[PDB]
Point group: C3
Amino acid sequence: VVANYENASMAADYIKRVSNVLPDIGIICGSGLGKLIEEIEERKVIPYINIPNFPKTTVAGHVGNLVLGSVGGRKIVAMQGRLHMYEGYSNQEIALPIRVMKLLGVRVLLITNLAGGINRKLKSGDFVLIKGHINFPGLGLNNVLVGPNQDEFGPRFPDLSNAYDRLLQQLALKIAQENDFQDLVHEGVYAFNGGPTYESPDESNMLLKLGCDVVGMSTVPEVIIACHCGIKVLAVSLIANNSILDAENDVSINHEKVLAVAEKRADLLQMWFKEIITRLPLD
Amino acid sequence: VVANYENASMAADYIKRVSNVLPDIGIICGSGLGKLIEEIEERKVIPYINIPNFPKTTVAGHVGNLVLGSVGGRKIVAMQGRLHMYEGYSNQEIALPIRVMKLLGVRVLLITNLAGGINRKLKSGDFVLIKGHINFPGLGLNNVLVGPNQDEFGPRFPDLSNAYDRLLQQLALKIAQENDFQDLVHEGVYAFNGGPTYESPDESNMLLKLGCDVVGMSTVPEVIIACHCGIKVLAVSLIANNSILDAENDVSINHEKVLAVAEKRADLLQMWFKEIITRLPLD
Amino acid sequence: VVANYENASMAADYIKRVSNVLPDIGIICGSGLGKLIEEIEERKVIPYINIPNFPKTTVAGHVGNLVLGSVGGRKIVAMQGRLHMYEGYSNQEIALPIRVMKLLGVRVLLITNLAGGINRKLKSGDFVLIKGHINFPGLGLNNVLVGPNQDEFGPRFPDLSNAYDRLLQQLALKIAQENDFQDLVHEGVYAFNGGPTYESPDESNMLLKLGCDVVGMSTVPEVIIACHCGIKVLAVSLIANNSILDAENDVSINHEKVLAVAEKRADLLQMWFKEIITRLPLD
């Protein structure tokens, strides 16, 4: 199924009819960071498998629902079950849910992920406001926009200079300051490692040379599709480990250690994002 | 359709029969730089859609003709309508037109493109003679030659040390000197960004660290297919913007600004290439 | 055919029945380095084309046999005919032979390749014990593990910190010292260039900046599949040329010069690996 206008329109029309929610804000959560989606009020849960033209996720399995409702006095739509390109999803499959969000009325997309620290100062448990990225798949002819352009959604050649909205970054930091946890909050450049192997020790060392602060396997494709269709983005990485120190010390990373850090910060991150939502422009 | 010997041969035979031109020189023009193709004398225009085994371009649309005839006293063939890999064309589709040029008798291929400046000295409107490249798709398993080798055209493992012919570079510079515009002409390494998003600000900064002078989304695949089958190449980038300064100053790029720079230099570039053609070896 | 548990199991069962060999050690040889496979005692030769679910290699052609038997008092299985991703093989095709080795009982995989020197000290004819890698295809969404994970073989997110077993490196070096050729043996980081064009001169220069010691077009995919399923790896590059010096001096590489270096060192490399096999743990 192509992520085109007719196909996204049919998905959006089904979602509107079933939910009776018109959302202004979209949310995509990293692994183990899904608590916010559980605090959604008057929730409507729509399985991906019921939505016309939505991508098939049963090979990967695990949950796949759109959840719509209210949080922090605002109407939102959340992806419960994220699509990652290391699973083998096509550009069309990644793009279609975000384009449906655009047609549902989403103007701001909030994204979290778990990532490895490349800046030597970053500690496990820190938050990084992403201010820019290095898209290795994009440089290498695997950009999520490769293929015919869908002109109905955006231009052939997007500029990504404002992909990570500066005012949303400033708002997120302001709220951390008001709540006295700004000592956890950094800003940084995210390197997109297609995955699914963790960055090798020598890859980490290369990324340090190239100016990256964090590394992960997600987020950049959604950011690009959102930027292409005019949706503002705030993206926040939770640091699971410091990959540069691990490289220098011969220490391994594993998904279990990673999920343990998400458990440590999930509630704070939920409280932070709920307050961001309440403080977003009504426009 | 594979870009193999039988299939390229059938395309070449059709082109020869219809045009009655045997060309020595091939031309592929960047966006907005197609004026030379309009100065071709005794022209024969052959729509791609009429040529056996030529790639289908109707999803992207826009013009797709081979134009054969005389320029500057020489027989040439030009691609009016270029195939870019960010459109989703396969390796076989990119390779087939250049291999047909080889069978038509092309010995030299002249290419122009629009590109972003990474060297801080490069100004909008400057020309860069390309002397080498950094092929990010190639390093990342998206090289245009991935797949079975077509032994009839060239070796399994091409060396690209002389991909950009030194004597053609020297000839191009000599002509710029004779016409007193050498102050516009630089030489440089081209970084191939698969596209279609413009290089992000942090990507630009990375390319500066890695020794690149310019960045763009084209040219390198054609250069590799031409080098593989023994066709000499001259490739010239027109600088549309300085991406490193834009990154440092938070300024966006857009395709419209880009096409405005092509309009500014198109006539000079046409005059330059016409004189290059007239001055090429008869061999 | 997917490289899944049922399909690898059917291949392994056929191989066991036909060979009557249960191997502990696997061997994959670089081009022109296949002499060891000729010293295998009580050999059983099984054409890839006879093995259920094995990948089709007739488009590339050339030899494709599994050879099982004894070397150095140990039971081994060797791939006579290697699958390279620049040929266009899918992730599933690359992964399946290594996963069959796992099911046959392989605990250690020995790999050789021919590679270009990026460290300025490396000479043609030197050996490099690989201690780490920079996986450009992996960073760029062409990792050999992209696709659904096969949970029966290994985790969704492998860590590669110990991908190149340290004790095997130490054993290989010890044996070189005992035989007084340690002056040929270096250790280094391998950059995986998807290929099949050789690294361009400016690509070589970039790799030098990024900390790479050698560059080649193989090995890293097999290492990742082996690491994923718990097989220990020793990988040794034979330096065919110094690519950084060639870049600095405008000298070309060609496959013929490369095969001439393999001929020069093939017998020593065979003797070295035979002694490594004899000295491996019985566990």
